[PDB]
Amino acid sequence: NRSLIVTTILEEPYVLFKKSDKPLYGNDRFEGYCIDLLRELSTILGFTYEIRLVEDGKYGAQDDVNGQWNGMVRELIDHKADLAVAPLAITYVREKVIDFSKPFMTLGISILYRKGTPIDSADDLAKQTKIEYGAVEDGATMTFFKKSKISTYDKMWAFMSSRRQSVLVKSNEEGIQRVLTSDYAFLMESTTIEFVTQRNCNLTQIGGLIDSKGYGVGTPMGSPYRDKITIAILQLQEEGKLHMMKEKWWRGNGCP
Amino acid sequence: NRSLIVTTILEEPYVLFKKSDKPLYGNDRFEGYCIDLLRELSTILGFTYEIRLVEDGKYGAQDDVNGQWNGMVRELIDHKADLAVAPLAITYVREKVIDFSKPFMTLGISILYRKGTPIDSADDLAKQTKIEYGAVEDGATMTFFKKSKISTYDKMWAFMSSRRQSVLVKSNEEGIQRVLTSDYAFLMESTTIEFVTQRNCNLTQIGGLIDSKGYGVGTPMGSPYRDKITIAILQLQEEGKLHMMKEKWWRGNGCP
Numbered sequence A, B: 001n002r003s004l005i006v007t008t009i010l011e012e013p014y015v016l017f018k019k020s021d022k023p024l025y026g027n028d029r030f031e032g033y034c035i036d037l038l039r040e041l042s043t044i045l046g047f048t049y050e051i052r053l054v055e056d057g058k059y060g061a062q063d064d065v066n067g068q069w070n071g072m073v074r075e076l077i078d079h080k081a082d083l084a085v086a087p088l089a090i091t092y093v094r095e096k097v098i099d100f101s102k103p104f105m106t107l108g109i110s111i112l113y114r115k116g117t118p119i120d121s122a123d124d125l126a127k128q129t130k131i132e133y134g135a136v137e138d139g140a141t142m143t144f145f146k147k148s149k150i151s152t153y154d155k156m157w158a159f160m161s162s163r164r165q166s167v168l169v170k171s172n173e174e175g176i177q178r179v180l181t182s183d184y185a186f187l188m189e190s191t192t193i194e195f196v197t198q199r200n201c202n203l204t205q206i207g208g209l210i211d212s213k214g215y216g217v218g219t220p221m222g223s224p225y226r227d228k229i230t231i232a233i234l235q236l237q238e239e240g241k242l243h244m245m246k247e248k249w250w251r252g253n254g255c256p
C-alpha cells in the first residue's frame, strides 16, 4: 500500500476539472473516465495516490535533435511519477522507453469534419489542397503521418509538413475550434471524435479508423505495477466495468 | 542461438496445413495468419523456431477441482514451449499464470444474422421470442452471457439456458448453417463472424461488439521474449502489416 504519484493531462472526457462554485481540494478537483479508472485500479491494487497534472502539459514525444523525451513519458522515465493514467497511445517508440499496461480502450486515428459535404475519406482530403487539414503538433496522431510510408498518408504529411505553422494546432480545444470556424478537417483519435460528435451536432467522423491502437497506463520501465495493472484492467473489462465507465462518460448530451 | 519451440493449434484461417503441389518440409507445411505473424516476428527478433501442434487440442483452461491447466497455456507454464502463437484470448485467469504480448488483434462477441431485417442489436433479439438465437455450448461466448449483469444479456442467457436443447449447438459450423436455413441468430467472436460474412454474402454482423478482448502471443511467466514480441507487434501494426495480413486471410471472393 504505497502512496503513488499519478501523472495525467486535461482532456475531456478522460480528465477535466469538476464544475464547482468554490475551490475543490487535491484529487477532488478532477473528474472523468480516467479518474474513475484510476479509482477502480486503486481499489483493486490497494494504493492511495496524488494526481499531478503533467508539468510541461504534453503527452510525450522525442526531440529528434537531442533524443530527449518530454511530457508524461519523460516524467515516468525520470521516476517523477509512478503511473500515467490518461488517453496516452501505446506506440512502438514509447513502449521502447516505458512499460505500458495492456490497453484499457482501443481506438484509431480518424477525421473530424462538417456533416453534409462530399468528403468521405483520407483519400478525398489527400487529393486536393482546397480544404485544409492537420493534427495536434507532437501527438501520436501527428507522429503517425510523419513516419508513414503508406501512400496517402505520406502525401497528407507533405501537405502538413510544409504548412507546420498554419494547419498544425496546439491542442484539441484548438483543432475543434478550427473545424467549427473555418474550412478544416481535424485528424484526431476516434474515441475523442465520438465524444465531440455527441456535443457539436453539426460535426461528424469522416471515414473509418485509419489505424488501430490502444490507450494504456504508463509506468516506468521495470515497474512492478505494470503487470498488476494489466491484470486489474482485465478484471474490470471482464466485469463489464470498463464498458459502464465508457457509457457514463460518452453519453452525449442528446445529439439529434 | 537456440531455436524456439512454438506451440499452436489448428484453427482456420490462423493455422492450417497448406495445400500445394510442391514438396513442403517442416514448418513450411503450415500456413495462415498466425504462421505469417510468426515468420514476421522471427525476422524482426532474429530467432529460428519449430512449430508443434498442442497435444490435447486445447487453448488452455484451468480445472475447477485441482487447479491444473491444459492446452497451450499448460505447455508455457511447464516451459515446454517458448511461445504460443495462436488466437489465444488475453483473459484475466490466463494472464495471471503466463505472460501475454500486447494484442495482435482486438475483437469482441457479436451477432451473425441474415441481411435485410429490422434487427439491429442484442436488445432487439432479447425482447422477442420469434427469432431464436444461440451460441456454442460451454464456449467463451456462453460464459459471457451467464456472468453478465447487464439487463439485456441477462434476458438472453435466461432464454438460451432454458431453451438450450433448441438453441445451443456443439460447433460454430452447426450454428452458421442454422442462420442460413432458419430464423436464427448466432453469437460468436467477431473475427469468426467476419470470416463467415466475407464468404456468405447473404449474412451480416448485427450491432457492434458486445465485449472487448484481444488475441496475444503467450509466453511463460518471466519470459525475456514477451516485451520484445510486444514491441515487434506494435511495429507491425504501425506499418500496416497486421492489417494487410488480416485482409489476406479474411477476404473472400467479394460481395456486392
Ligand SMILES: N[C@@H](C[C@@H](C/C=C/c1ccc(/N=N/c2ccccc2)cc1)C(=O)O)C(=O)O
Pocket (backbone or CB within 6 Å): A056, A057, A058, A059, A060, A087, A088, A089, A136, A137, A138, A139, A140, A141, A142, A170, A171, A172, A187, A188, A189
Ligand atoms: N493521445 C495522443 C495525443 C493526441 C492529441 C493531442 C496532443 C496534444 C499534445 C500536446 C498538448 N499540449 N498541450 C499543452 C498545453 C499547455 C502547455 C503545453 C502543452 C495537447 C495535446 C493525438 O491525437 O495525437 C497521444 O497519446 O500522443
Ligand SMILES: [Cl-]
Pocket (backbone or CB within 6 Å): A100, A101, A102, A230, B100, B101, B102, B230
Ligand atoms: Cl503487456
